[PDB]
Structure 1
Amino acid sequence: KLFTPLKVGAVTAPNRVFMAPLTRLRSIEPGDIPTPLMGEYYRQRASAGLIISEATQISAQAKGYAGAPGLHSPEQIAAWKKITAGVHAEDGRIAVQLWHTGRISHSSIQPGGQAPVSASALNANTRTSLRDENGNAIRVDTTTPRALELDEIPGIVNDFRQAVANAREAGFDLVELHSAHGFLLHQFLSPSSNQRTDQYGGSVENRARLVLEVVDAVCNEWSADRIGIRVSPIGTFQNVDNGPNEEADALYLIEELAKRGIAYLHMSETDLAGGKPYSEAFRQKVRERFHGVIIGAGAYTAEKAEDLIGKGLIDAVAFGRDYIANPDLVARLQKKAELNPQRPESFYGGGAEGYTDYPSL
């Protein structure tokens, strides 16, 4: 089933082998600008059923990693237009993953060198990636954030809205809202990171309020059939857990998302460091609550993907690290060919080495 077509909102994927969003931290600074090298990397992978881009800033404030691209400035829009054109030239499809990093950030890459923002004022207690004086990636402890004031929340929603407008102009086929992995939207969703006492904290309805305002805004800006969302609602991701009622809270959020008739739900099932597997019962509960495409991700194999697609529980699989190392992953999985070995040391930062130099068959 992996090599059969699938309608995904406004487009049709020719296969179910998707490229997961993968931060590679190779953009130009100053300007957080996509490059021709990034264009080549995505063009090499255009046989994917769908490419989901690396996480991309909705605004300058959204930045948390040196080398991550934006989709807020004219120069960024112009550069992304070239990238999507290259993918389209090879008959591919590409979604842009849009984030605000919130508290997973550092003051040195924030506007004015000031503290980053979040739901509440507590430190992420993790690291982000900056660049040193020679442009090489380095890991640095996160800066303590300040809590967004209530009157700043509409501006966040507007920044997502505007970034989706920009994505449409840049020629993306779809957008993926980054509501996972401990970034801003997840910081609001999670009780561990959200201690607010206004209408954006406390109950699950309040904790989900921001992400649902964002979904509504971007559906209105473009169209619901252009919108996907990535969630990581079971387990702990970058120190952000999903709280004591994670299953019930996940199902609440998914039911709300379904009301908007969006294109897809992308579930990041496990952190890279591992987590409890999804039960089939939970998968069935998700499936009956959402009426668009469901994408599974997190250490999948082709075998696991075929099993779950055949069981009618998911529609597609996003592969991350296998896509880093195998531009023609689709052809390799179809032919049962060996994969190129991964070189994790060059996942983040640097240049062509470990990026565009993994060969196709």
Structure 2
Amino acid sequence: AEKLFTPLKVGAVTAPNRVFMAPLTRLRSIEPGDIPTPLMGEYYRQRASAGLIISEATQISAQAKGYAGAPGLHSPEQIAAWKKITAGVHAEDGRIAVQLWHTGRISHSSIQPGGQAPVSASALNANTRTSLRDENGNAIRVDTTTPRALELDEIPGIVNDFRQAVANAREAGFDLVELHSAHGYLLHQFLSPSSNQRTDQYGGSVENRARLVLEVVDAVCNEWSADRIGIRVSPIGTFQNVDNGPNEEADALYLIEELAKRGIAYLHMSETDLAGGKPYSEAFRQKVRERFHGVIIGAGAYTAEKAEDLIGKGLIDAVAFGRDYIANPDLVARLQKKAELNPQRPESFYGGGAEGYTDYPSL
């Protein structure tokens, strides 16, 4: 029997199905101000039949910015714009979480406050690219700037920025928040020994490496409620040159046991980047499942059939689809009916306007 189209309690909200829209950076916000737009509102409204929409990654602060065109949730103007977007999703009977990030070293000095180097756990270049805008406003890929290591006394400010962004998110009408602790961004930069060479209380042992993300979790649970908080992790494998170190499984299980103590709404596991990699072992999935007592969302080149299999095995609760949600606003109906999926147009994933954004048809 199919379970994808059955309801699921996700902390404080109830999803009517298990087909979630993964967080998808689309880089269509207004500059100056990193302001969401009515076009973005239309895009999200089109996808409101998702069991849960998880927004594009959204800055907690101006310092958090690493991509031209990515929205923020730190300014009054951003709060006002997001309020209209969440109202539109709710008018269509949807549910929407905001994914909150700090990009850390995956950034460029030209888009940082004061034109300064971005920050990270350690002063190590990401050795990758980010997306800026050229003089005509078009997306361009540019090598990342070498970061400055955060001073110990700057850490409380980072925690406060997450806390403040969650206050703002609650005000803006989001149903949940997802902390971006994956994919080589700031929280993951602290988690991974490959990017964290600190020798203070925020590096070294796994307890120290997870310290920042757990302080953030505690701060945001206190600001709102634990049943409003999810977290995305990518703790097995390599993502944007950030591996998970030489004890990745044990370190992941430590973090997950710690997260379970807070009673948070969900754990969202990004299992692979677009280039793929070794699948999660069923033993690992079992170890995660016995340790965490909230919703588990799986993501990364899923099919509906794989999601059904893992839901049936009692190992995950929901699936997040990324690219299929870019191209199929009514992905839920298509998967329910076994309809074909619209052809994807990758050239318009990042930047631009309505074309390749709001022009993918429903059935």
TM score, norm. by length of structure 2: 0.99
**Cα distance in 2 for residues equivalent to 1:87 and 1:331:** 17
Measure, in 2, the Cα distance between the counterparts of 1:92 and 1:309.
22
Deviation of the 1:201 alpha carbon: 0.2
Structure 1: distance between partners of 2:300 and 2:220 = 27
Q: Secondary structure at the match of 2:251?
A: helix
Cα distance, 1:156 vs structure 2: 0.1
> How far apart, CA to CA, are the structure 1 residues paired with 2:198 and 2:15?
41
Asked if residue 190 in structure 1 is aligned to residue 188 in structure 2, the reply is no
Post-superposition offset of 1:171: 0.2
How far apart in 2 are the matches of 1:45 and 1:271? 23
- Give 1:274 shift: 1.1
Deviations 1:312-341 (A, max 9, x none): 000000000000000000000000000000
In 2, distance between residues paired with 1:323 and 1:257? 28
Separation in structure 1 between the aligned mates of residue 343 and residue 281 of structure 2, nearest angstrom: 31
Following TM superposition, by how much is the alpha carbon of 1:60 offset from its aligned partner in structure 2, in angstroms? Answer: 0.1
1:258 counterpart residue number: 260
Partner SS state of residue 230, structure 2:
strand
Structure 1 residue 119, shift from structure 2 partner? 0.1
Q: CA RMSD in A?
A: 0.3
CA offsets, 1:214-250, max 9 Å, x none?
0000000000000000000000000000000000000
Q: Which ranges in structure 1 are unaligned for 5 or more consecutive residues?
A: none
CA displacement, residues 290-327 of structure 1 (integer Å, 9 cap, x when unaligned)? 00000000000000000000110000000000000000
Query: Cα deviations across residues 246-294 of structure 1 (Å, max 9, x unaligned)?
Result: 0000000000000000000000001111111001110000000000000
Query: Where do 1:258-337 residues align within 5 Å?
Result: 258-337=260-339
Question: Alignment partner of 1:288: what SS?
Answer: helix
**Percent of residue pairs bearing the same amino acid type:** 100
Q: Distance in 2 between matches of 1:152 and 1:89?
A: 41
Give, in whole Å, the separation in 1 of the partners of 2:123 and 2:283. Answer: 37
Deviations 1:83-102 (A, max 9, x none): 00000000000000000000
Question: Which region of structure 1 is more displaced relative to structure 2, 268-277 or 177-186?
Answer: 268-277
Distance between the aligned counterparts of 1:197 and 1:280, measured in 2? 35
Q: Deviations over 1:171-209 (max 9, x none)?
A: 000000000000000000000000000000000000000
**Cα separation, 1, equivalents of 2:200 and 2:355:** 48
Cα distance between partner residues in 2 of 1:150 and 1:273: 36
Moved over 3 A (4+): none
CA distance in 2, matches of 1:232, 1:137: 26
Look up the SS of the partner of 1:65 in the other structure. coil
Distance across 2 between alignment mates of 1:327 and 1:128: 27
Give the Å deviation of 1:360: 0.5
Q: Secondary structure at the match of 2:98?
A: strand
What TM-score comes out, normalization by structure 1 length?
Answer: 1.00
Spell out the pairing of 1:1-361 with structure 2 (5 A cutoff). Answer: 1-361=3-363
For 1:132 and 1:321, the matched residues in 2 are separated by 25
Aligned residue-pair number: 361
Q: Secondary structure at the match of 2:5?
A: coil
What SS does the aligned partner of 2:72 have?
coil
SS of residue matched to 1:84: helix
Alpha-carbon distance in structure 2 between the residues aligned to 1:111 and 1:360: 41
Measure, in 2, the Cα distance between the counterparts of 1:211 and 1:73. 23
